[PDB]
Amino acid sequence: EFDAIKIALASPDMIRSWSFGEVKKPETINYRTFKPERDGLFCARIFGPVKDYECLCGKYKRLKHRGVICEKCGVEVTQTKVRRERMGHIELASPTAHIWFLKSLPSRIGLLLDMPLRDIERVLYFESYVVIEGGMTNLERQQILTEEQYLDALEEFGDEFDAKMGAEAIQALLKSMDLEQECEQLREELNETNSETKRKKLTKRIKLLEAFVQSGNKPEWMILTVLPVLPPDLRPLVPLDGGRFATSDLNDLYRRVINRNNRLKRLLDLAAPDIIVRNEKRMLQEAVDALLDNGRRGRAITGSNKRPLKSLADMIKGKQGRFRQNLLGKRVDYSGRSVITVGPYLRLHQCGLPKKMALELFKPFIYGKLELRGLATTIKAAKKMVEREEAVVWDILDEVIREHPVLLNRAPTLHRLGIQAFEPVLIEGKAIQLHPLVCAAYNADFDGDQMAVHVPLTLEAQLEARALMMSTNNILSPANGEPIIVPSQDVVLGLYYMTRDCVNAKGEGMVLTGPKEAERLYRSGLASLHARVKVRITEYEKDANGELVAKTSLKDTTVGRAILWMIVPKGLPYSIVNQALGKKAISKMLNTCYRILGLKPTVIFADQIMYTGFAYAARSGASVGIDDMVIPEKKHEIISEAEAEVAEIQEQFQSGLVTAGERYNKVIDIWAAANDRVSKAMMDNLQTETVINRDGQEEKQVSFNSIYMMADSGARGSAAQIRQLAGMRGLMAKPDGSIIETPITANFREGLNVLQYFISTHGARKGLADTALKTANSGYLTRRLVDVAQDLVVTEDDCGTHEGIMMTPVIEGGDVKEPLRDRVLGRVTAEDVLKPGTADILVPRNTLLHEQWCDLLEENSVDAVKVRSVVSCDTDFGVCAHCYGRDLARGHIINKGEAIGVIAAQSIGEPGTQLTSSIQVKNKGSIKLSNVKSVVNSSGKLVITSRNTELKLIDEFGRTKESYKVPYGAVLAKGDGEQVAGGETVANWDPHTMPVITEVSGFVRFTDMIDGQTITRQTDELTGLSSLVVLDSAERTAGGKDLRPALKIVDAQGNDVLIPGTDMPAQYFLPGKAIVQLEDGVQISSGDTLARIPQTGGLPRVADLFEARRPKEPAILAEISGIVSFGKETKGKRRLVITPVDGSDPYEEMIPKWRQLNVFEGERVERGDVISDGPEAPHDILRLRGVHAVTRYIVNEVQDVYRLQGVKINDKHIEVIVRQMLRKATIVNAGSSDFLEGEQVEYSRVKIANRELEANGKVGATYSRDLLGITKASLATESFISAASFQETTRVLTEAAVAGKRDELRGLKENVIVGRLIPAGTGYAYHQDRMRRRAA
């Protein structure tokens, strides 16, 4: 209807235009007749009649004569709702400053006038005068003149002198101000001499003057002359039961403003002393300030209840304002709630709805049906029929409900599966029956939880619920590809018990004809559910283009597996059910069914699995008793032995042989070992049993114990819970985080005594508090993540880009913890996947890698692919479907319009509550060295001559399996190009002192070495050797301080030995605190040690890693490639200069001397190398290394937090957030564009700006990408309606008003506030068509 919203400042003429009349009296209503007063806050003349079509007096009280203004009253005869739309105005006697434009942090008034805020405040409060265009009389504009100074200046000046006080002075200043001429003057200033901040401040001044000139506002509009009055019905005075009333706080504030204004107007007629009028004007300013914003400049005015009054500003901001409490979430019609029960008889797509709730929610539909079918004549008859609950009413209700989805929702909606659409089934009672398989999606248990039910109304809403939100459409998690409809705890136990063989059961050794005979035998009592038999099984294979060829063969199975085979669909093999079928086997089975067959067979299969599991779990009759918790028979011996060892340690400490800090650890280790022994003994005794037999001999088998069965199948429990039940409760902690030495040696089968229970309580209280805190934090993280990345939408099919990420498996030193299949499945290749033999292309390009392609890649053993990624997408304002991948919840390539930002935010935030030397090879392969320079030492072996050496174990198949990091100068047993066996330590080194080593051998002379200037005399008394320890710069004398210890290599012939392969002299400038051991003239072998130089986690790690915080001590990277050099020393921090090979060297950094540098001044380093060592910074990687390196550092550094806790989410969702982090570009060269040199612009704008410009006959502009946090990157929103929702409302509206900003609703958070279709999903087509017609 409008398609855009504009905001600006209001002129007094505009304010008089809005109003329908002036409010002159502070009266509200008569205390006797309760009628609106005349010219008061509630006035019928100004704001409209109080009841529909009726004058106040009553002479005109019918619709027939509407639109007429009664002469007696003046009240127009119209609808009363018009009182909700009409404003008034109050003409202030004297101008008042607007608090938003005075006490804002930038202080718009002061910024525009170029005056300190304190000067403005003191002139406002009638403290000192101000000269306004004084003239040529030796006065300076905007000069403070206190009362005495003003008085003595007035003398000797017959001129007016133009001095004023109060807000009138400010208004005169603003009105006299000229913006174009001052902008010209500032341009002249910027043209001339420039200083560090002079140029910046002048540029800011000119830019903001230009902005204010272009906004269309005028400065003097910041000073109020007329005050608008809100319509009465938004600040109502409403009668409550009895003689009492309730009123809004705005009535009090308006009454105060009007009282003081009228008093001032009266006072200005009496010609009162200036003291009185000054005080009155100060009070008027204070009252208007309190009205517009109460509690911002001074003390908040309070009411009778002694609480601060709510002002106009308080009604907009906060979590209880119109922007948040009512515009983004509000109460809804056609809704209900109730407690949820099980209902295990249901199908996956339907729920159970009480008849009473269904009758109440669908009332209009039932009225329509009753009238249509002729049962009722009018709607009143239908109402009475439904109110009496006749017989026909229930048939009509059953007809209405037939195919009408209802949305069920549970209160903590953490992801999109917390709302799902089901088909109702009318039931008796008052509880909602919820299908078991969906509980995990809701995180719902049946111990008192409640659910809300909403009913879609429109045809479009019903179709969306049926096609998008149905429960049979969401069976895969959207965070990863895994199903979320897995059977949970009792289905698992039933299917485990059914498929679980026994050694010598009834009917063992039989040969059945198929599943039917197996079931017929079991059900008639002739065979046991686990009796090993031979069964003829017929299974189908898709060994063709979908043909399902059959194969019949005699399998060796049990009766349970043969029975369970009856429910498995055609395409699957028989080996899926031919096992014990724990918790994870069932999930694998469902995943296999989904990938091979499709969606419908999977849903049918899941329902059959649930039914069979429940039936046979009931059949088994599995229970829990006190004899199932078998305590080990050796527990007392183990505890006694631990007691003896700890007592011996204590008495040894009492003899002063060990420090307490070590005996504590010894006792802790003793008790840990004892606990491990007890747990091992318990589990050994509890997981096996002896049975007999086919012939009569003792034979072991896995136990049928009930606790063990529950833990082993994954139904419920673990080894820790069993350990506490039958082992020992373990080792408790303390409030300080310490671990109390003596553990709880009792389990729960045995009782705890009072002290052990006291310690347990210590633990439990902390557990509860930590749970609460985690739930608190994980919501804030999700809210920020949604705010930053809400408006991302797939808005293209292919951008055509040829770039992407390089996906390879993740290896933490030893084993691999994420194969290539997990990281590559479902993505789009950016380049041909050449065969590892380099023969031909294996996967051409732009091919969505589904399961078959992943299997092919695994078969050919490729370990590196190039996959298109979101962070390297060429689409402007959105993403393309090919650079994203596939949906992960539907299984196909993502659809256009899908909102991927909200999905990414929800997927990242949903699991938040859950989360809290020598090198030895391990496999028979071949050593491969990457990024290392080799050389042969004196011993003849190979020594590393590099800092970034990487060792890989390339097996006979050419696949990496072990990646290891080796420091500098390590002796290697083997090298590249030689096969090795297992268990061979191919590298070793000393992890102590310093790795400073030489490179050649020969006579060493102390060149440029003077005793008493750089070294100290410290002879090795123990060995008798003389060692020259190099002191520091401070201690040493200045005679040779600038000199450094250089040890040149020479021969016996008197010549000079230089670095082999080059003419560079071989000198080693050793640093301070270096212990020179070998004397001059003593030949050294290659690599000799010249000097023995001495020396978070959980959610907060993720939250501080999306905020791009800089660590405490960031490792210094190589800013530029070139020879490293040094400059002036000890100028607060050690100075280092890098000189490129040819390029200029304007780089110099004050590197602190505290950092232990790992590079010598004679060693060149390229950019991106580490100078110091420590945690890396996120900003430095982006600058030194491309975008693909900072994203790789993040998607791997936050995925480590989740992997530890077992949470798995796709990498798609972390690259969506990163794409929104590095979104602003900083320009370095303007080029032929229209961009300022030092400016930050949206990277999308600059990318397209120079793109079209380059195509023409111009040259594009360079830039440097920038990285922000999710909280700083969400403040760059270009709409002031979405920004005010989650930012400071006062700041956003104050800056948008002066700038004359207008925003066209283009986001998801703005069309919700306005109340129109979002541009993301089903509303994507509507918005595109609107833009097309609008362009025309």
Binding site: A4, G329, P412, R416
Partner: protein, 98 residues
């Protein structure tokens, strides 16, 4: 607790709250995010306007339903009109450009 239609609040024309007042269910921001994760634009629109505080759109929806026609004319909510009037009651001039 179940509700089809009932009494509405005074200053903001939204359904009252609580079972005693025969109130509605609060549809918060997380549920809006959930409906945005699906492409359920029409469900979201009808929950934001017709079902909550679109004063003249909800009676039209009721009449359409009791007439065997499930179609809505969405309109503009009341909370946004109140917000415009409150922002305008300050010195700001916020309008709806066509």
């Amino acid at each position: 607790h179940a509700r089809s239609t009932g009494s509405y609040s005074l200053v903001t024309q939204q359904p009252l709250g609580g079972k005693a007042q025969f109130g509605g269910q609060r549809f918060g921001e997380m549920e809006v995010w959930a409906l945005e994760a699906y492409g359920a634009a029409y469900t979201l629109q009808e929950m934001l306007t017709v079902k909550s505080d679109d004063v003249n759109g909800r009676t039209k929806m009721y009449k359409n339903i009791v007439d065997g026609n499930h179609q809505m004319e969405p309109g503009m909510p009341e909370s946004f009109n109140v917000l415009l009037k409150e922002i305008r009651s300050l010195g700001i001039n916020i309008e709806l450009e066509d």
